[PDB]
Amino acid sequence: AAKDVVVAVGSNFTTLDPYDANDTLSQAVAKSFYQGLFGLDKEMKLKNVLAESYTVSDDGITYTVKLREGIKFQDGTDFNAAAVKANLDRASDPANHLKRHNLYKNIAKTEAIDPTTVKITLKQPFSAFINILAHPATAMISPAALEKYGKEIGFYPVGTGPYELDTWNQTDFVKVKKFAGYWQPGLPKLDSITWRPVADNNTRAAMLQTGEAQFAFPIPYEQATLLEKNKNIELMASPSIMQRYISMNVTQKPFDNPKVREALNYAINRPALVKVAFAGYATPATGVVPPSIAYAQSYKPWPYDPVKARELLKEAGYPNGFSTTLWSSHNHSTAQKVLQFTQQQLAQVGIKAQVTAMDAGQRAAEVEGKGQKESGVRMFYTGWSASTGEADWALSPLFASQNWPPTLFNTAFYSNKQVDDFLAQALKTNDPAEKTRLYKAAQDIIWQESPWIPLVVEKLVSAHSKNLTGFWIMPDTGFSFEDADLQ
Ligand SMILES: [Zn+2]
Ligand SMILES: [Zn+2]
Ligand SMILES: [Zn+2]
Ligand SMILES: [Zn+2]
Ligand SMILES: [Zn+2]
Ligand SMILES: [Zn+2]
Ligand SMILES: [Zn+2]
Ligand SMILES: [Zn+2]
Ligand SMILES: [Zn+2]
Ligand SMILES: [Zn+2]
């Protein structure tokens, strides 16, 4: 019997060459034909994939990876230390100007000691490197295919995965078919997968209804109830890695005063916000890092208390609040309801905030491309996904004093001697204990200094036919379908 499943996704794909994509979706789909040395499961946990095992010098500089022998690429060629070298050399060559260059520029060189042994030496220590190797961007592509297609490799992928490219209709869909020579006997179980972009949200959910699609994501809030009521459809609300928050320019107006920051955090009723802006598909944030990320810490939740808040602003010296600005990035999602709710809650405590949604231009001009002594940024509503699955990318770009704009995304212009050093120390050790310890310390300082108003952490809403099993949504919004099957 023919097992042909259709997945209804959210947008169009950019490229099928992982190294050249900034959107998770395209990377997730390209996972049909590509595998990495390592990868993360649906709980965001480390797994050895094409790699058998690995070792790292106490110097943190040298990584020695053992590979599984006998694996073939979809074009008949062999997967070996040389192919890994070719994939890594290419990714770390700036001349290639591949969108994900920054994830490999720290690689000094890759050596093929033997067909099943790869020696990678970094320029500088970076304990999160193993995570970079498990990232869906680091795909092992066919050296032969890299040469045959050159710069068009992103259209005609050739990897070691369970599916081969059947055909791609730029706007219509990406259809992949079962690869007979897949290195794992018995897989895949499916004969084909058809990834179909469906921009209309209501239509996406509707297809699960008619049976037109067996899996879909994301699912609109209104359509959620409908689907969950259907016995042929399984609707899930899973944890994501999207942190929602409002940063405060800790070097400005009343925000320099830590009492104000502590105050404004009492002003927001988070459980109410999750209902009003996310339809209950999120949770109040009890940390600055989504708990699904490795090394994250969680704390006792912020109570909601307008009285405590107004009192604190008074002690601070603002018996009648004050006025400030609240910027958010222009979008069509839930942001709109978040702003209206927030400035309303802030109004209750006397904080007149002038909301403003900015397009790509103003955002890059007023928020990202601007330094402290110029920036107008005061209160900023935004979000962030640590797509590496570990604390560093969830913490450095947002709190490391060196990452203030236009360098990186520390919109709160926060800084702290200990945190910066704790973050730096973390990257120079590979001992889990030390790492959980170092990161835990930085987070405790951050949470207590409150440079933010951590709002919530979203929930991913997906749904699939009861018949489709082994098909999962990952916190980073990618898919895990190693053992997918149909009955
Ligand atoms: Zn490019
Ligand atoms: Zn050749
Ligand atoms: Zn040649
Ligand atoms: Zn076909
Ligand atoms: Zn065909
Ligand atoms: Zn249709
Ligand atoms: Zn399920
Ligand atoms: Zn109180
Ligand atoms: Zn728009
Ligand atoms: Zn199921």
Side-chain angles (χ1 to χ4, degrees):
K3 301 180 179 179
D4 303 290
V5 349
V6 172
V7 181
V9 297
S11 329
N12 272 300
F13 309 105
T14 55
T15 175
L16 296 174
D17 160 24
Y19 298 93
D20 210 5
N22 284 316
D23 58 292
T24 306
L25 176 52
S26 297
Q27 287 172 175
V29 158
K31 198 171 166 185
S32 297
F33 3 69
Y34 290 134
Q35 304 178 115
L37 306 184
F38 305 78
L40 300 184
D41 66 3
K42 65 200 195 82
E43 276 76 35
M44 240 46 209
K45 273 63 179 71
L46 202 284
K47 317 182 307 184
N48 304 323
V49 187
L50 287 175
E52 195 160 290
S53 70
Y54 83 91
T55 263
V56 60
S57 60
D58 313 318
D59 186 39
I61 300 290
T62 297
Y63 285 77
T64 297
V65 187
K66 229 70 214 317
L67 317 170
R68 318 173 108 69
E69 178 58 288
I71 307 185
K72 298 278 186 169
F73 283 106
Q74 289 146 175
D75 60 11
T77 58
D78 293 14
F79 167 64
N80 54 210
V84 182
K85 188 223 197 309
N87 266 286
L88 245 32
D89 287 330
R90 172 174 164 272
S92 57
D93 191 305
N96 288 313
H97 59 85
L98 292 167
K99 297 199 175 178
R100 308 311 296 254
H101 174 229
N102 295 312
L103 300 180
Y104 318 89
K105 64 188 196 62
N106 183 234
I107 299 178
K109 58 185 164 76
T110 304
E111 314 180 34
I113 311 297
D114 53 69
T116 62
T117 301
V118 174
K119 199 162 79 175
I120 307 172
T121 85
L122 315 181
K123 296 186 179 180
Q124 291 298 303
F126 193 67
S127 49
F129 183 63
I130 177 66
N131 284 268
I132 289 181
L133 295 176
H135 189 111
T138 322
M140 294 301 103
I141 316 182
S142 170
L146 288 168
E147 162 174 40
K148 183 204 285 182
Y149 304 110
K151 297 157 190 176
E152 280 206 295
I153 184 68
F155 292 97
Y156 311 103
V158 182
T160 64
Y163 304 88
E164 291 176 303
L165 175 56
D166 171 22
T167 172
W168 180 14
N169 303 49
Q170 294 298 66
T171 294
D172 277 55
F173 58 74
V174 169
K175 186 173 182 177
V176 307
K177 55 179 176 171
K178 179 173 185 176
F179 175 39
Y182 187 60
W183 65 281
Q184 289 181 294
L187 299 177
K189 307 299 185 180
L190 310 184
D191 291 299
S192 75
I193 298 182
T194 295
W195 308 84
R196 296 176 58 188
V198 179
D200 197 67
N201 309 317
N202 296 341
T203 302
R204 195 146 63 272
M207 285 171 53
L208 278 181
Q209 294 272 203
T210 68
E212 166 156 22
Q214 292 73 60
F215 189 93
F217 167 82
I219 291 179
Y221 298 155
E222 256 285 347
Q223 300 298 293
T225 193
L226 273 168
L227 292 173
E228 189 180 308
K229 84 77 184 184
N230 195 304
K231 62 161 190 174
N232 298 305
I233 291 179
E234 196 138 288
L235 178 136
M236 277 193 274
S238 26
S240 76
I241 58 167
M242 179 61 79
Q243 176 82 177
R244 289 301 182 185
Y245 62 92
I246 290 173
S247 56
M248 296 174 276
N249 197 335
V250 307
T251 74
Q252 291 303 351
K253 269 63 176 174
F255 304 115
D256 64 293
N257 186 306
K259 271 186 174 185
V260 176
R261 290 192 262 92
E262 171 180 44
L264 303 190
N265 274 94
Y266 284 94
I268 316 303
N269 184 341
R270 296 182 175 67
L273 169 66
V274 319
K275 292 181 61 176
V276 167
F278 301 85
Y281 293 107
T283 67
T286 56
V288 287
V289 174
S292 297
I293 301 295
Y295 304 123
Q297 287 296 148
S298 52
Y299 312 85
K300 300 174 69 64
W302 278 89
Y304 164 57
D305 194 340
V307 176
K308 170 59 175 185
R310 285 188 287 275
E311 189 197 60
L312 268 160
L313 290 174
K314 188 170 182 171
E315 284 172 27
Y318 307 81
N320 306 150
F322 60 74
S323 292
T324 187
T325 58
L326 182 66
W327 305 350
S328 67
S329 187
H330 161 61
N331 83 153
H332 298 295
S333 296
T334 47
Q336 176 260 300
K337 288 183 178 300
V338 169
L339 297 180
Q340 173 171 45
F341 177 81
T342 300
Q343 85 159 178
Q344 196 172 177
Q345 294 261 91
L346 291 172
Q348 286 300 154
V349 289
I351 300 304
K352 310 75 183 182
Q354 186 56 60
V355 177
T356 307
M358 313 172 301
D359 49 49
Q362 325 183 194
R363 194 177 174 303
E366 294 299 354
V367 179
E368 320 187 75
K370 194 156 298 185
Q372 167 63 56
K373 311 165 301 174
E374 332 285 2
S375 185
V377 169
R378 219 95 312 186
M379 293 195 302
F380 189 32
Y381 169 53
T382 186
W384 183 273
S385 289
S387 56
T388 48
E390 107 291 347
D392 187 66
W393 196 244
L395 250 29
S396 279
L398 283 13
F399 306 111
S401 64
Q402 72 252 29
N403 298 319
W404 291 2
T407 296
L408 206 34
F409 214 60
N410 182 324
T411 62
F413 292 90
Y414 176 79
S415 184
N416 187 115
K417 183 67 172 303
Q418 302 182 66
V419 170
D420 275 54
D421 172 65
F422 278 158
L423 290 190
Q425 285 191 62
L427 258 43
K428 296 196 175 192
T429 170
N430 287 96
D431 174 15
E434 276 308 296
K435 299 188 70 180
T436 62
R437 147 174 183 274
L438 288 177
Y439 281 119
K440 176 187 192 300
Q443 274 171 285
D444 293 324
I445 298 179
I446 305 172
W447 184 259
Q448 45 182 160
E449 303 208 318
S450 297
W452 285 358
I453 300 183
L455 292 169
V456 311
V457 176
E458 278 175 38
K459 271 181 185 173
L460 300 179
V461 173
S462 65
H464 58 81
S465 158
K466 246 65 169 172
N467 301 309
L468 209 203
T469 55
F471 211 101
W472 284 288
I473 199 64
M474 288 174 50
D476 64 344
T477 86
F479 315 98
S480 174
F481 46 109
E482 178 186 316
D483 299 304
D485 205 323
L486 267 192
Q487 55 181 171

